Amino acid sequence: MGQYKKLWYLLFAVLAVCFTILGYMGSEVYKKAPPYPEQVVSASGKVLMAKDDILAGQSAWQTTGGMEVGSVLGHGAYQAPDWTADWLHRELSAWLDLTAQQTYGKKFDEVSPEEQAVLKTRLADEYRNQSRIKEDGSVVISDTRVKAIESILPYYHGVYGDDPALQTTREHFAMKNNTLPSQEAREKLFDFFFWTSWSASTNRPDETFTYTNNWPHEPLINNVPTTENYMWSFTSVVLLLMGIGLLMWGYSFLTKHEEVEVPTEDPISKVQLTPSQKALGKYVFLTVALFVVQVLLGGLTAHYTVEGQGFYGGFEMSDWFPYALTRTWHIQSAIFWIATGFLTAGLFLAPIVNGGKDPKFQRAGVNFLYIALFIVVGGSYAGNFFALTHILPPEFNFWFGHQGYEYLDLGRFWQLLLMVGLLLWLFLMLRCTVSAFKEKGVDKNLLAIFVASMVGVGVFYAPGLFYGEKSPIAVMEYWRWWVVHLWVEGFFEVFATAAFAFVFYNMGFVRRSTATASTLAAAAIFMLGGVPGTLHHLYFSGSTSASMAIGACFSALEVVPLVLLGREAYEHWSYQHLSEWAKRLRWPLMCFVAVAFWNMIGAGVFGFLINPPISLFYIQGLNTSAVHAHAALFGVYGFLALGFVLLVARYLKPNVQFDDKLMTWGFWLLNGGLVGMIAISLLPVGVIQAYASITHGLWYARSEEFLQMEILDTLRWVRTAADLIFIGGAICVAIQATKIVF
Amino acid sequence: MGQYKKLWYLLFAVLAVCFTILGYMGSEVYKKAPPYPEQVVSASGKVLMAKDDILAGQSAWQTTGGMEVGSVLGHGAYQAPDWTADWLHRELSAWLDLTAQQTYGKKFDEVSPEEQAVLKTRLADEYRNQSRIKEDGSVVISDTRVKAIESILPYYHGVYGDDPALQTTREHFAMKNNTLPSQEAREKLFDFFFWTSWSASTNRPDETFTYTNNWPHEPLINNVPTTENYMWSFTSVVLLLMGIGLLMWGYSFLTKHEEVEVPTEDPISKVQLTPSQKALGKYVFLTVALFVVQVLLGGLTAHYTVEGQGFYGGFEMSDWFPYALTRTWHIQSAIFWIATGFLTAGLFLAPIVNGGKDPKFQRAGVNFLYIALFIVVGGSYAGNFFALTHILPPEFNFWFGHQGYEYLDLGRFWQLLLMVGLLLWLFLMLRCTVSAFKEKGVDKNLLAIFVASMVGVGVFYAPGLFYGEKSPIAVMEYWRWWVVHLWVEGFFEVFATAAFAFVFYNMGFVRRSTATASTLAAAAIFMLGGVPGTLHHLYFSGSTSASMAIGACFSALEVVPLVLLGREAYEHWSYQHLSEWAKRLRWPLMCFVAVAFWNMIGAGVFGFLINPPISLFYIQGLNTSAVHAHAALFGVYGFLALGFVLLVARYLKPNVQFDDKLMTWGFWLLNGGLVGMIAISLLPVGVIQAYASITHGLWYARSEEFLQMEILDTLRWVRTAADLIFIGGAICVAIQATKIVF
Numbered sequence A, B: 001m002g003q004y005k006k007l008w009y010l011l012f013a014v015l016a017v018c019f020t021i022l023g024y025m026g027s028e029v030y031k032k033a034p035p036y037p038e039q040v041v042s043a044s045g046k047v048l049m050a051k052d053d054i055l056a057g058q059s060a061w062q063t064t065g066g067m068e069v070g071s072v073l074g075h076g077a078y079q080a081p082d083w084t085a086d087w088l089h090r091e092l093s094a095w096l097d098l099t100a101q102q103t104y105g106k107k108f109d110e111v112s113p114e115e116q117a118v119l120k121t122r123l124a125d126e127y128r129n130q131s132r133i134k135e136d137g138s139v140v141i142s143d144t145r146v147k148a149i150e151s152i153l154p155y156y157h158g159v160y161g162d163d164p165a166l167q168t169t170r171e172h173f174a175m176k177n178n179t180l181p182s183q184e185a186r187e188k189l190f191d192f193f194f195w196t197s198w199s200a201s202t203n204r205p206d207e208t209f210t211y212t213n214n215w216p217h218e219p220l221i222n223n224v225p226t227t228e229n230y231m232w233s234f235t236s237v238v239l240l241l242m243g244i245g246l247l248m249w250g251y252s253f254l255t256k257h258e259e260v261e262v263p264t265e266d267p268i269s270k271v272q273l274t275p276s277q278k279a280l281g282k283y284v285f286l287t288v289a290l291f292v293v294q295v296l297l298g299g300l301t302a303h304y305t306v307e308g309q310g311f312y313g314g315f316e317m318s319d320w321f322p323y324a325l326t327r328t329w330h331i332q333s334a335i336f337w338i339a340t341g342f343l344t345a346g347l348f349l350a351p352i353v354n355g356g357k358d359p360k361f362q363r364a365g366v367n368f369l370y371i372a373l374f375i376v377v378g379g380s381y382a383g384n385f386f387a388l389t390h391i392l393p394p395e396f397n398f399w400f401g402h403q404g405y406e407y408l409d410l411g412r413f414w415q416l417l418l419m420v421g422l423l424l425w426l427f428l429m430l431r432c433t434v435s436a437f438k439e440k441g442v443d444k445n446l447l448a449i450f451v452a453s454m455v456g457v458g459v460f461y462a463p464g465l466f467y468g469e470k471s472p473i474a475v476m477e478y479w480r481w482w483v484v485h486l487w488v489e490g491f492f493e494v495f496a497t498a499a500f501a502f503v504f505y506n507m508g509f510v511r512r513s514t515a516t517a518s519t520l521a522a523a524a525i526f527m528l529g530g531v532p533g534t535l536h537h538l539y540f541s542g543s544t545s546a547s548m549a550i551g552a553c554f555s556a557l558e559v560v561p562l563v564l565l566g567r568e569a570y571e572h573w574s575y576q577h578l579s580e581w582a583k584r585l586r587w588p589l590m591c592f593v594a595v596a597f598w599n600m601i602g603a604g605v606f607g608f609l610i611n612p613p614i615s616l617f618y619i620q621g622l623n624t625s626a627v628h629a630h631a632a633l634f635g636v637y638g639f640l641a642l643g644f645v646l647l648v649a650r651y652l653k654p655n656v657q658f659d660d661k662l663m664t665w666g667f668w669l670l671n672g673g674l675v676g677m678i679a680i681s682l683l684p685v686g687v688i689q690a691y692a693s694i695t696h697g698l699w700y701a702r703s704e705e706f707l708q709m710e711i712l713d714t715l716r717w718v719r720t721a722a723d724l725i726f727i728g729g730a731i732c733v734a735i736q737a738t739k740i741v742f
């Protein structure tokens, strides 16, 4: 529209192209995911399992908590092993031992390297080629394979049950006793584990690589990166560097950095607060309180990684609040409090868009949304608690208990209710912008893009409802990453950028044209990479090689604007020196400066570390992912939510001054604790694990023997100091916000 | 000094640390290079070769032209194969065939995959472990290995001799008939080829990887990247991205972009020209004429890659001007004309530093330098011509003929004379700055750093004299890359930056403080990466794993300032709009803008494509290196030299106006021809080769059968159009410069 028509058309074209690519890859995921075999039958004719057994095992896995106990196909938690890789390696080792006894009369390790080479070529042929699914949907496995499977089942029954010989192992895995109490459910669960391993080690019908693109790294069957893996990794590096250079060129030639005269009074402080705006103090307190609870839950989960089952000393903690539960609550609370901060920012800005007045029952809607958020959080957490104790019967686990899928752990009922709450929030936003859009004579492009960002935030949680309990793992991964990657990464980024532009234009820090054009171009750039870059979560989950290529190349373009965020950091930081009333905004602006810094480091650097297929092939499911998760999710969106609620609190209680000493302490403790956690614990552990994964295979890097090495135990312990520093910073920030609002 | 003391100390500390690292790695190269075995003896006791035979083979290789016919250990030309990889693969294949006949009675390809696995583990053990050099300096090889070597010698005798059955192959290799006419010299040469292969396939005495860090990729003996290769590649990526982000942060927070009022008259045009300055018109013409001759030689060399021995039709061209000679002249002419442009810029600026007057006999010195440059060029080229025809007797080849080492192909005598000429140039510069340094009351920091850059340019050609004809290959590589990488990349970059600062400050486009601080910080940043980054040329030439780690990590820091060169590009481009007399500088400034663009793309992007060990392990010696070489060397330093001589010509004949139509045509034809060459020929060939190298091994990607594939032949042909466009641009620029100066 107007002078911004070309930018609007660029954004529309980018959206159409990128979503077409993502949707066609979704159809590919549906069509090319590893099949659940109708029957897995031994060469002698006995049926070992059927498709329904595998699906029941998937359900039982969800009941144990799924991705919050170990990982499957490289997704999940990092204390316990990746069950796919561990099962694959154990089964291959058993096959080799049995075959070596049958062929040379000794164990595999006691025969000559030549004999070992013969055995390994036999093993590779059997697993990769002979196990390929037949036309009738059947998988035929050898009798030796059947015996190998039967030999490793007791280990997993002990790990998931109450075997006194496996107790230590269970503690080393941060697993409670009787994670899956039912023997029959455990048998189904190990059917599902076998299925995963089979998909990871069986060539695609028309290819020489497996359904998982040869993941995990397993030298025994030559599970190694394909040539296309290397090629597309290098291509993504080239695209990243060229995009960075060209974006820098465009910034240098197309941006003049105009100087704007700051208004003498704060424009936002001049508008009288509406009742619904004043009702947002409880939202501010909810955000900071959930932040404190979340970091405390992280401390508890971390204690489980050094003391697997026991506190320092009443009752057994691991029976009722095991590592699985505390990890679930730690991740879900992160999502909840960041989202609540964003929603509070929106609900505060909405009446200002509506001319400083509330529509009818806007405060009632705000209160209803608050109550609904409490119901979602409390109900989902109670459901997790009763699912993990297996008090809740299995047939209700997916709807009310634990979905077992990371970041979407809450039961489907609570997910539906959260979707309804987000829709209600969107309604309360849009009804405050209708009148502003009906206004005559005013350019609405900035408001249009801000409203589009609102719609994205309030709608794109829906794809998390597109999979079911029995949905194939690959389909669930596709839709889950729609939510986690798209809805958070891309749409929260766009909403934050548009909110920045709208807010800073209203305060007079930026020109309308600059804010509008910057927001439109930034939205186009963010979407171009983020939308198809969703596929970097699906390299090894049963998607095809082409999905990996698209994910790598487009996700590289996500980093391009991130490493240049020094410009915006400087602008936001300089705003506080523009006037005396701008100095009242120092700490929200400092939070946004930290957002820029961590969007650069944690998102760009530590996400591209794990982004190329050649790297993620080896380090998917290692601690480098935890490094990136903490740095990106908190430093970007945690600091964004904190800055938002701090701004809201400043305008809700304008008579209260920020405590500069307390805020300095909290801000620098948060930043220093994040840096310290990464530098002294998480990154060294990830590097050591990466060395092990590249050298020996992923199963080794996740093994109990390797994770219990003294250096790794020490590094996990050492994290406590940085963890305490970070928690101190979080407590300071929460205290400041609570003092302002109450 | 003064306010710049911290910058000076930072630069000094960077220089000390980085040169200490590079020197300690030089000691490591001396101590850990693959030994030349005293004797290579069969298991039966017969001596196959001795150290002196290998060194004589090295000398004979130099006589054929060395790196200009094929490549050895991944360095050299790209038409003919990498003789190390080709020899290794041929010998391993012969060993496997002989062993399979002795063990199973059939060829290796006709036995079962299990039998092949047994044979390959035997082969790997023999080559990697049993071939390790003994304490007495001896290498003991099997009788089967001896027979395998004897079976492949006829092929190489045909390739390097006149065998009518190998004629086609020779044409496909762009090799003349009788490249090495002497049979005994050929036997020595194949001793040297064996030595290289042995070093590439034999484990280091204390390690499980070879002297070449497992290069080349050869699946037969598991010549695959080590774990440290992966680890340091990922580490270099992280360092690159973090450095880019932090440098952007520093630019945003520490640069204010001050506005400077342009003087009403051009300050440089006010100074009357000295006789030595006027004597530089012949230098300008020499630069552009050598540029035209160089691009024509490139066209001839490219014609040899599609028609290996024959022109379109008198006498046989390949006997007297073979591909080896035209390639040698193409590379040497590039060096000569870029260096001449830089020297002309210095010699023009020197009297301006001296207050606009010449010291005694400065014009005589300029004329003497001109004559010495002609003698070096003509003598070295004649020596190459008489070396490649073998008219020059072998004992004088290294001093007067062809060194066989790329970029240092000229005989050692001419290299010494060029060193003397560079010293004379340095003297003529420094004697014009003595009086400026003796001046009272003026800040000399900018002049000090500019003079330091002069000293670097005039001195750091010397390390090319630190190796001899019989020096070990690794030592020669270390010292050769001192010159090619350090002296050109780092010191030409620093000299160009300092020249930019000094020139633009004298014209009044920048403030003195800004120019000085920018130059000092840029010099520190460039040196920090460039100096230890020299080791990225030595990953697989017999250096250790630690050398690879240091090279990867520090070379990644070279890219950090390159991708941000949009800032300087915009500044240089904006200078032309500052005043009416600034518009007279449009085309030198356009050349410098192109320098920024190509320093970004060709240097940063296409150098980091090939920089990480994980990538360069597979693609060293492929056409991606040619992509990067052309883009970087011309677009950065070719455009730099062209802009320098254009500026000099503008000030030597101020009454002559630039022809905007001719210059627009030439500028855009050069840029478009470079882009086209890369996009339509060189990069696609490099990508296809990379796929082949990753999938099958380097020997396959360089093989005659692969290079003669119809797609690759077509892509080589297609380069002609872009080549003609580029040559048209070069002719236009040369015509403009000649019209101005004459």
Ligand code: HEM
Binding pocket: A076, A077, A078, A079, A294, A295, A298, A299, A301, A302, A303, A305, A327, A330, A331, A334, A625, A626, A629, A630, A633, A634, A638, A722, A723, A724, A726, A727
């Ligand atoms: C003192 C503060 C914190 C501590 C001690 C902590 C500790 C932990 C631990 C022990 C895990 C599980 C590692 C495993 O799988 O074994 C984890 C995972 C996670 N935490 Fe934190 N955390 C803290 C702060 C935060 C914050 C502030 C956020 C977000 C705002 C956050 C988000 C996450 C996420 C997203 C994961 C899952 C990462 C993945 O699975 O890749 N954490 N944290």
Ligand code: HEM
Binding pocket: A074, A075, A076, A406, A488, A489, A536, A537, A555, A556, A558, A559, A562, A599, A603, A604, A607, A608, A610, A611, A616, A619, A620, A621, A622, A625, A628, A629, A630, A632, A633, A636, A637
């Ligand atoms: C604010 C921006 C971002 C946030 C909040 C974020 C958050 C996260 C989180 C929490 C995870 C852990 C997922 C899991 O537990 O399975 C993750 C994984 C991942 N991230 Fe991001 N990320 C961001 C940006 C990026 C960027 C820019 C890239 C690369 C260009 C990237 C690449 C990846 C990859 C490849 C994984 C998969 C790791 C694995 O499966 O082990 N992310 N991200």
Ligand code: HEM
Binding pocket: B076, B077, B078, B079, B294, B295, B298, B299, B301, B302, B303, B305, B327, B330, B331, B334, B625, B626, B629, B630, B633, B634, B638, B722, B723, B724, B726, B727
């Ligand atoms: C129409 C213009 C040009 C053509 C047709 C051309 C062609 C070629 C050819 C055929 C080769 C040898 C490839 C092989 O090894 O088989 C080569 C190498 C080379 N040329 Fe050019 N060239 C041109 C312009 C230039 C310019 C302007 C420069 C420098 C200012 C340059 C510098 C080099 C260098 C440094 C190499 C060696 C690269 C390496 O070995 O990695 N060329 N060129």
Ligand code: HEM
Binding pocket: B074, B075, B076, B406, B488, B489, B536, B537, B555, B556, B558, B559, B562, B599, B603, B604, B607, B608, B610, B611, B616, B619, B620, B621, B622, B625, B628, B629, B630, B632, B633, B636, B637
């Ligand atoms: C103006 C700057 C540069 C110039 C003029 C330049 C020039 C060249 C040339 C001519 C070659 C071919 C060498 C040969 O034939 O063996 C080369 C190779 C190479 N360049 Fe650069 N380069 C520059 C910057 C860079 C940068 C920034 C990087 C990476 C950070 C880099 C990495 C490499 C590597 C790894 C090779 C080895 C290729 C091989 O051995 O096949 N260069 N460079």
Ligand SMILES: [Ca+2]
Binding pocket: A075, A076, A077, A406
């Ligand atoms: Ca996870």
Ligand SMILES: [Ca+2]
Binding pocket: B075, B076, B077, B406
């Ligand atoms: Ca070369």
Ligand SMILES: [Fe+3]
Binding pocket: A485, A489, A533, A534, A536, A537
């Ligand atoms: Fe993502």
Ligand SMILES: [Fe+3]
Binding pocket: B485, B489, B533, B534, B536, B537
């Ligand atoms: Fe270099």
